[PDB]
Design a protein around this ligand. Structure first.
Ligand code: NA
Ligand code: NA
Lengths: 282, 123, 235, 210, 185, 235, 256, 314
């Protein structure tokens, strides 16, 4: 595939190239600063490390945990090199656009989001150090409920148009690009990803409620456990996580009637190779 | 944060620490200018002995070297016991060489571990 | 039945509701908590005193009632009146330290004499350098810290408030807690007639005690000179 | 030691059922305090507790109260530091079950138990000492005005310490460290009787005193 | 039906709360050791008042503090100005005169009967703050958009996107210009 | 009066009681006793008159304390939302330099100063309760007042007396004996900082060496000689 | 893991308290998570073990020995615990150390006679624990590692005592196991995950030796957020659960 | 009419509280100017020789004292050790104890300035007051000779040198003010109750070991035993004086109650002997002018306090 290079290794003696991450240079000499693969995109020459923390990018869809409540802002753990920030003016307040900036709601920030709360958000922009600035203004963004959290390496999250998907068994998955994953009971909002809907959208007056759906059947819970286990199974096999691979993992896992069985090594490997084989044969 | 646990010790432990740090830092994907290879050289009378063990470290003076990449430049130079000045340079000469070999070893592992985990991740 | 009047921890006061006619809803106030006890293999939801003292059930606006327990016969909370000492001043805010919460000194021991014979801050001695963060909450004389932002000084004209004309270092200021804030500071306010400077000294704590003459002015008895503060209304 | 006068280094150390009294609020520089003295045949103990708090905490904002418990050897260095810290951890669990921590965000409650006197004339005594620790800490917490969902009590029998709340219906603490092998039920019964007596005495002390 | 009756609940409470009180307190020379063995002025526990001070100047201070605080002055001024601004608005969009009404008393219901107008206005406020959806936005609105909202104050709600010929222009413009400018002319 | 007299802290103040006297550095008005008392060791200095005489004590000091209208040389050590964090002296409390405090400065047009840059400014605010404030413009008109960045020079630590003597006393020969050897740019900071830049590095170095050696020597007449020996370019 | 939101805690608790309990990974109440163990990798030591759990928790145990007079050293077995990221002063480290020292007390933790060389001398056993990583209470982890290390421990053979230069005798002893249980509502859980431990009402430390439920037994708060009281029948449940599902852990650990 | 409890007033304005109380002829500790706190003592209750009949074997405490003054409690325990020696009224021939003062306040960690300075000053004052001669710490080693052949008996006289080393642990509960005086007095009574255990023996050397039961009196110079007093000098501020419907200064005895400790900066502390001589004097004029009259009244009060503290028991 690509040229494998190690730190201090000469990549090229040519000075024409622009120099991206993973490289440093002396005059025309360009050296690698990491162990990884040489990447040439247009005039940009860089070296991509085999391993590394999630590096937030503008427009990314992530799941994060509130780490700190501060001055007009939140500090959110995304799993990157630095805590991301969530400006007070970068979130939706309970209601329509109408409410103007208040000092009171600044004093009751903890009522909207507090230390420990999980939320789904978007990377609006980046600071100079590379840390992310977040926003949750879309109706699909907000505090997460009715489910369980799990995580995988961010590199294993293959990307697409969407990262919120409806899965059989009535379970919605939220695949954060940072590897943070939320598995929830499918809501009416989630149901409405076709193509009284307005009342439905307004019904989520509470987007900072800490209470779950009082009715979560045992079926949905078992299915949550199974999805979690098979996602972890794909992670163990170092298989890229996609929606189709997740539902295929689920269905292939249905062989084992007890979800617990999915935590053993050979079962994980079996599910993985089943998916890969099925993919190659189709 | 670098967290090191010395499970077993048999002399020349400083260079070992250095090598471990280099390996682990490279594994983390953390950018650096080059390898740093750590080695130790004892001086028995006139002759220098490369990569001394515990018994050799006793009843002998040792020099620890932290060498940058394939260069002749030293990141670390440690002498904790008395050594004749006129024979110090010689001790460095083999040391550097030894360190280079050590680099070649660490490198040799990384590439393999790279080559393995960049091919299997494919498809 | 009648609510018991004396109270101790673990003692049940009354069930969650009661009818006498209309159905009183019982709200667990200060000194009480709504606990679901188990009796006879069956559930009972009861208001339980968590303190020692006289219980009170007072009435405020089918109709629910506030059940609390008052000691006799603390911690800064939102709405609590605290007495503070102005420690820092800046164009934006006033840093204070909480000395008392509701006629109750905090901490109970200020750490006087701990650091020697001079005039030393709570952590200005040898003990502060060797404090075990791992085994204790805070050091000897450590206080809850608070902030009175310039906006939260007055009710009106909040946009252009000069904090230097409101407070001085060393001043004792009566304030109310707006928010819990963060780990370092509570957020306080003096935006009320009974809130503000209750004690002050001329020449920034160096001179003698001044008394409040007008809403925005104190004066020194021996000098006759006047200094500008935001005075809390006595009586 | 640079902070203490330990004298010469060359020197070497010299080698060679029960009644209760409960009182509260006698220590002036803390929020709560309790004196507990116990007298059984050929065995006498006495210890003091002090509750400093609710105080401020160093570090990030905490959503609830943070309780610390410190056991201090009195007179004789009678016990091991590790065992003292173990018992401390046990008590921390118990009063984490008992104290209403929700009321005290960003706040720390530090409890000190001085084991002043522990001379039993009879000729692993930690077990028999734990229930009195619990008694004293509950008393001092109630004295400090620290909110408690219940009055934490305890009893000891055959090396088995059991700490109860809610009239002995449920368990907040269980400590079993050797001290022979007997069936669980009678240890439970004896410790529960001790618990109920201690509870009555503690409420009584809280009604004559506070 | 695990729940207990209120009477059963009170019973259970009486049985749980039961303890064995004992009047006298239980040798123990140490406890005894630790537990062994006026001020009607009230002028000492108050704010510093100088001993020197004459009574007249004290009366001056008390006088000064009996008069409204600057906060009170500005607050009352803003409240009065608010009242006359909201009446003047509601007047420009709902006519004013007494004792006869044609369906489609003066202001959309002696011009001292303005009190009644106030009585009406507050009700809207009273009525608005109560319901929990509105309370944030009303709390966040400044006096003039607040006035437009009071102006609007069941099925009237249209998601924000006795009669006057032109109120829509006036009130909605007032709602997001945040000025009384449209009404002034 | 015109005769300057040596004075110790605690000594009896020797000026005319009936004559009004504005008090400068060294002289302290006790907040409790209302007594005028000297608190610094040095030379007592009484200006002629005018309308009131100034009584101040010139004393040897190395530590600068911010006072208004002082010309200071700071170093940028931090960047904030609407201001720079500046150091006028190591280990001293930092000073604020507003972003608005520049010529042709608006919220859209910001100053281009980085951490580590030398700034030549004027102490505009030095309240005893607040952090000191400096400026790089005429506060009245808003245009350049000879303040701003100092580039590629060399800084020299010096005692306060030397700097004040350098800025105010025109009979001081150091600048003259320096001008005798080379052309140079100089910025004088009353905070005890002297900035010097010549076209050639050699000459700037010479200036540095001779200015510091002149600072260590009390005798004024020696300067010329020193300068000579220093501009002879010995090693 | 740790620092879950209130919503997450409520979900997990509701699943774990329902009948039957629904564990986040679908485990049975008595089911352990996959671990693997390696032994005999530290030549300098008399015994050695390394245990890796599925959640990442990794522990290393070293077994060393030294000759001592019983009379001067009544304690022939000493456990020293070192947890990474935790100071030796730390409360939890000294608690675990004390506990382990008591489980392994030569008195009745293990058979002291197996250590005796001469009526004046014996081998003191130094058990050094190094917890590289832990996301829950590591007491069972450590206990298992110590079990494996002791079951593969070799000592110099006796022939003042002198010893065989090349031949060594396998230390024969039945090491105890310590189990940790999570009390969630009316349900008992073995091998609690971090998220499970975050919402658990309480916990039970239960020692076990020669096929018998032995001391120490503790109640332990797995967190500080949801520590609640429990009914005695739960304690009985935990004990019964251990003594029912312990011999299979023993036969799994002792099959080499 | 706004009002503060005495506690929080002492926290808010200590100076004002002190002045205000002094305007009524009282103190914030509710005692008048020259009124000391009473003291109560439980002596030799923690020692191993507490009961001659049934001597506690496990105990290693040579001396004991439990003092209580006002609401402050001080517990002092004297332990011991032995050092191998190597190779008049002058200070060279005198010894001291090595005290560790632990003042129980909220913190946990290493010693505060208070604890360190109190410990050191206790040591130094014991040394300079010359209460403990080095000679009295000398050990007369008996020898353990074997009964016939078959066990062992010890013989004491009615060959290296050795010396006793005394250690003191002093804990202070419910501190309300300066506690040095309490620590000193407590240590005095404790030292009076100390009994030195008898000791015997069997490039190589054998250990010396203390007898289990036998003990000789720690003979200290009772002539030189002093007791501790402290005093504050307060300058009355005319404005803070109550109506009670030109400068003055008052002397205050036995400081307490924070208001006094925070406000008063002119202090006197005395170690005075019942005989009439003084063992220690400390003058600190941090506030009000310390006049000779104040010094003399202070010495007088210190001596009557000394007679009191030495006589009130036995
Ligand atoms: Na190298
Ligand atoms: Na807390």
């Amino acid at each position: 595939d690509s040229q494998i290079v190690t730190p201090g290794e000469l990549v090229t003696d040519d000075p024409i190239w622009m120099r991206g991450h993973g490289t440093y240079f002396l005059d025309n000499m360009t050296y690698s600063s990491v162990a990884g693969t040489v990447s040439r995109v247009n005039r940009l020459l860089s070296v991509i490390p085999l391993k590394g923390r999630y590096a937030p990018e503008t427009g990314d869809h992530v799941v994060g945990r509130i780490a700190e409540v501060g001055n007009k802002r939140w500090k959110v753990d995304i799993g990157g090199k630095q805590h991301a920030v969530l400006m007070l003016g970068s979130v939706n307040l309970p209601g329509g656009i109408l409410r103007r900036k208040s000092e009171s709601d600044e004093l009751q920030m903890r009522s909207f989001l507090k230390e420990g709360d999980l939320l789904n958000a978007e990377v609006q922009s980046l600071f100079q150090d590379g840390s992310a600035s977040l926003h949750t203004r879309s109706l699909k963004y907000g505090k997460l409920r009715n489910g369980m959290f799990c995580q995988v390496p961010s590199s294993l999250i293959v990307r697409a148009k969407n990262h919120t998907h409806n899965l059989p068994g009535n379970i919605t998955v939220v695949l954060g690009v940072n590897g943070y994953i939320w598995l929830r009971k499918t809501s009416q909002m989630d149901l409405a990803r076709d193509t009284i809907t307005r009342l439905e959208e307004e019904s989520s007056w509470q987007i900072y409620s800490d209470e779950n759906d009082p009715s979560i059947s045992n079926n949905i819970r078992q299915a949550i456990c199974r999805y979690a286990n098979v996602i972890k199974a794909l992670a163990f096999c170092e298989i890229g996580i996609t929606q189709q691979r997740i539902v295929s993992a689920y269905e292939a896992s249905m062989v084992y009637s007890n979800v617990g069985e999915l935590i053993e090594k050979n079962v994980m490997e079996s599910i993985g190779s089943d998916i890969l084989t099925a993919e190659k044969m189709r | 944060d670098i967290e090191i646990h010395v499970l077993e010790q048999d002399g020349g432990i400083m260079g070992s620490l250095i090598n471990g740090i280099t390996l682990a830092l490279i594994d983390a994907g953390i950018s650096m200018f080059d390898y740093i290879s750590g080695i130790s050289v004892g001086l028995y009378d006139t002759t220098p002995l490369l990569d001394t063990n515990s018994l050799e470290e006793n009843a002998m003076s040792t020099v620890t070297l932290g060498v940058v990449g394939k260069s002749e430049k030293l990141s670390l130079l440690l002498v904790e016991d008395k050594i004749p000045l006129d024979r110090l340079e010689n001790v460095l000469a083999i040391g550097i060489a030894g360190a280079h070999r050590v680099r070649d070893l660490m490198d040799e592992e990384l590439r393999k571990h790279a080559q393995k985990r960049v091919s299997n991740a494919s498809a | 039945f009648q609510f018991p009047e004396i109270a101790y921890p673990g003692k049940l006061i009354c069930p969650q509701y009661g009818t006498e006619d209309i159905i009183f809803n019982y709200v667990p106030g200060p000194g009480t908590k709504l606990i679901q006890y188990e009796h006879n293999g069956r559930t009972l939801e009861a208001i339980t005193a968590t303190l020692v003292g006289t219980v009170r059930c007072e009435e405020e606006k089918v109709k629910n009632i506030l059940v609390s327990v008052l000691p006799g016969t603390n911690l800064p909370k939102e709405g609590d009146i605290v007495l503070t000492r102005v420690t820092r001043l800046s164009l934006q805010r006033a840093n204070v330290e909480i000395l008392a919460v509701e006629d109750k000194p905090s901490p109970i021991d200020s750490g006087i004499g701990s650091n020697g014979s001079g005039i030393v801050a709570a952590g200005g001695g040898s003990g502060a350098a060797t404090f075990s963060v791992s085994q204790a909450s805070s050091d000897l004389g450590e206080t809850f810290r608070g902030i009175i932002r310039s906006q939260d000084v007055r009710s009106t004209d909040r946009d252009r408030v000069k904090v230097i004309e409101c407070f001085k270092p060393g001043d004792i200021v009566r304030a109310q807690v707006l928010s819990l804030g963060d780990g370092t500071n509570y957020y306080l306010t003096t935006a009320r007639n009974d809130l503000g400077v209750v004690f002050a000294r001329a020449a920034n704590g160096a001179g003698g005690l001044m008394y409040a003459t007008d809403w925005q002015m104190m004066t020194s008895p021996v000098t006759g000179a006047t200094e500008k503060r935001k005075c809390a209304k006595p009586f | 030691d640079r902070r203490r006068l330990l004298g010469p280094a060359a020197a070497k150390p010299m080698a060679f059922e029960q009644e209760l009294s409960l009182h509260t609020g006698f220590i002036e520089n803390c929020n709560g305090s309790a004196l507990v003295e116990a007298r059984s045949l050929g065995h006498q103990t006495s210890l003091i507790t002090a509750v400093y708090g609710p105080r401020s905490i160093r570090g990030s904002f905490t959503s609830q109260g943070t309780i610390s418990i410190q056991l201090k050897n009195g007179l004789l260095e009678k016990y091991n530091t590790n065992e003292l810290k173990e018992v401390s951890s046990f008590l921390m669990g118990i009063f984490n079950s008992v104290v209403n921590l929700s009321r005290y965000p960003k706040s720390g409650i530090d409890i000190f138990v001085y084991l002043t006197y522990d001379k039993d004339l009879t000729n692993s005594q930690i077990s028999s000492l734990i229930p009195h620790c619990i008694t004293s800490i509950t008393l001092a917490l109630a004295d400090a005005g620290i909110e408690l969902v219940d009055m934490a009590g305890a009893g000891e029998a055959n090396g088995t310490v059991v700490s109860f709340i809610k009239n002995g219906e449920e368990i907040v603490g269980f400590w079993k460290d050797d001290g022979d092998d007997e069936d669980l039920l009678e240890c439970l019964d004896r410790c529960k009787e001790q618990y109920n007596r201690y509870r009555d005495l503690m409420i009584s002390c809280l009604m004559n005193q506070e | 039906d695990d729940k207990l009756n209120l009477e059963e609940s009170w019973k259970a409470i009486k049985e749980m709360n039961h303890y064995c009180f004992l009047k006298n307190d239980p040798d123990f020379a140490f406890t005894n050791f630790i537990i062994k063995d006026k001020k009607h002025n009230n002028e000492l526990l108050g704010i510093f008042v100088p001993c020197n001070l004459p009574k007249t100047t004290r009366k001056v201070a008390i006088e000064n503090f009996n008069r409204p605080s600057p906060d009170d002055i500005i607050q009352s001024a803003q409240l009065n100005a608010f009242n006359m601004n909201i009446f003047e608005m509601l007047r420009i969009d709902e006519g004013l005169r007494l004792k006869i009404y044609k369906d489609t008393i003066g202001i959309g219901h002696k011009d001292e009967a303005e009190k009644l107008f106030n009585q009406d206005v507050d009700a809207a406020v009273r009525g608005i703050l109560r319901n929990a959806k509105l309370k944030p936005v009303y709390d966040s609105l400044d006096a003039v958009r607040r006035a437009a909202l009071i102006n609007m104050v069941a099925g009237f709600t249209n998601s924000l996107r006795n009669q006057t010929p032109n109120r829509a222009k006036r009130v909605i413009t007032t709602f997001r210009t945040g000025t009384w400018d449209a009404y002034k002319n | 009066d015109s005769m300057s007299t040596f004075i110790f802290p605690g000594d009896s103040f020797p000026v005319d009681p009936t004559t009004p006297v504005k008090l400068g550095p060294g002289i302290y008005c006790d907040p409790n006793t209302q007594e005028i008392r000297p608190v610094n060791t040095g030379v007592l200095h009484v200006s002629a008159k005018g309308k009131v005489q100034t009584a101040y004590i010139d004393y040897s000091s190395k530590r600068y304390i911010p006072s208004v209208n002082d010309f200071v040389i700071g170093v940028i050590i931090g960047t904030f939302s609407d201001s720079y964090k500046v150091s006028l002296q190591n280990f001293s409390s930092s000073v604020s330099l507003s972003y608005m405090a520049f010529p042709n400065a608006s919220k859209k047009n910001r100053p281009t100063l980085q951490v580590g840059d030398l700034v030549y400014a004027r102490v505009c605010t030095a309240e005893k309760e607040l952090e000191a404030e400096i400026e790089c413009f005429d506060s009245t008109t808003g245009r350049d007042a000879g303040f701003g960045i100092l580039e590629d020079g060399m800084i020299i630590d010096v005692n306060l007396n030397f700097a004040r003597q350098l800025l105010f006393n025109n009979d001081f020969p150091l600048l003259k004996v320096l001008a005798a050897h080379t052309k140079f740019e100089v910025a004088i900071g009353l905070n005890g900082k002297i900035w010097v830049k010549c076209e050639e590095l050699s000459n700037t170095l010479a200036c540095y060496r001779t200015i510091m050696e002149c600072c260590q020597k009390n005798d004024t007449a020696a300067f010329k000689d020193i300068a000579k020996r220093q501009f002879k370019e010995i090693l | 893991h740790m620092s879950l939101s209130v919503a997450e805690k409520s979900y997990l608790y509701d699943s774990l308290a329902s009948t039957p309990s629904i564990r986040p990974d679908g485990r049975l109440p008595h089911q352990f998570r996959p671990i693997e163990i390696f032994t005999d990798f530290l030549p300098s030591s008399n015994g050695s073990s390394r245990i890796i759990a599925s959640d990442g928790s990794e522990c290393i145990v070293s077994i060393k020995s030294k000759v001592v007079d019983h009379h001067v050293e009544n304690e022939l077995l000493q456990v020293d615990v070192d947890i990474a990221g935790q100071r030796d002063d730390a409360l939890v480290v000294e608690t675990i150390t004390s506990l382990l020292n008591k489980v392994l007390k030569s008195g009745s933790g293990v058979d002291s006679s197996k250590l005796q060389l001469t009526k004046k001398y014996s081998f003191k056993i130094f058990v050094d624990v190094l917890v590289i990583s832990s996301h829950s209470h590591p007491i069972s982890l450590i206990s298992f590692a110590i079990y494996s290390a002791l079951n593969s421990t070799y000592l110099p053979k006796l022939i003042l005592p002198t010893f065989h230069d090349y031949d060594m005798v396998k230390l024969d002893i039945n090491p105890p196991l310590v189990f940790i249980l999570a009390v969630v509502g009316n349900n008992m859980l073995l091998d609690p995950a971090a998220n499970e431990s975050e919402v658990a009402n309480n916990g039970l430390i239960i020692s076990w030796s020669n096929g018998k439920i032995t001391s120490p037994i503790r109640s332990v708060a797995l967190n500080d957020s949801n520590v609640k009281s429990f009914k005695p029948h739960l304690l009985k449940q935990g004990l019964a659960m251990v003594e029912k599902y312990a011999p299979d852990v023993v036969r799994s650990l002792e099959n080499l | 009419p706004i009002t503060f409890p005495p506690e929080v007033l002492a926290r808010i304005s200590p100076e004002l509280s002190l002045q205000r109380h002094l305007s009524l002829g009282i103190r914030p500790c509710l005692r008048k100017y020259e009124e000391f706190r009473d003291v109560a003592i439980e002596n030799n209750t923690l020692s191993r020789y507490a009961d001659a009949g049934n001597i506690d074997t496990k105990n290693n405490i040579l001396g004991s004292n439990v003092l209580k003054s006002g609401k402050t409690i001080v517990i002092t325990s004297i332990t011991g050790g032995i050092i191998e020696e190597t190779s008049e009224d002058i200070i060279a021939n005198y010894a001291s104890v090595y005290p560790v003062v632990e003042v129980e306040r909220g913190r946990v960690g290493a010693c505060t300035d208070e604890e360190m300075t109190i410990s050191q000053k206790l040591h130094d004052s014991i040394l300079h007051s010359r209460i403990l001669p080095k000679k009295a710490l000398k050990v007369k080693a008996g020898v353990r000779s074997a009964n016939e052949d078959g066990t062992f008996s010890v013989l004491y006289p009615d060959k290296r040198k050795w010396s006793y080393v005394l250690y003191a642990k002093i804990v202070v509960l419910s501190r309300t003010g300066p506690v040095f005086d309490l620590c000193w007095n407590s240590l005095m009574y404790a030292l009076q109750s100390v009994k030195l255990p008898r000791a015997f023996i069997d490039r190589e050397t054998y250990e010396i070991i203390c007898d289990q039961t036998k003990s000789v009196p720690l003979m200290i110079n009772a002539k030189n035993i002093a007791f501790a007093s402290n005093y504050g000098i307060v300058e009355l501020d005319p404005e803070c004086q109550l109506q009670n419907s030109k400068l003055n200064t008052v002397l205050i005895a036995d400081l307490d109650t924070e208001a006094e400790e925070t406000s008063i900066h002119s202090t006197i502390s005395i170690l005075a002997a019942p005989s009439g001589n003084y063992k220690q004097l400390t003058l600190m004029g941090g506030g009000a002018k310390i006049t000779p009259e104040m010094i003399k009244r202070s010495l007088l009060l210190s001596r009557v306090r000394a007679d009191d503290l030495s006589t009130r028991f036995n």
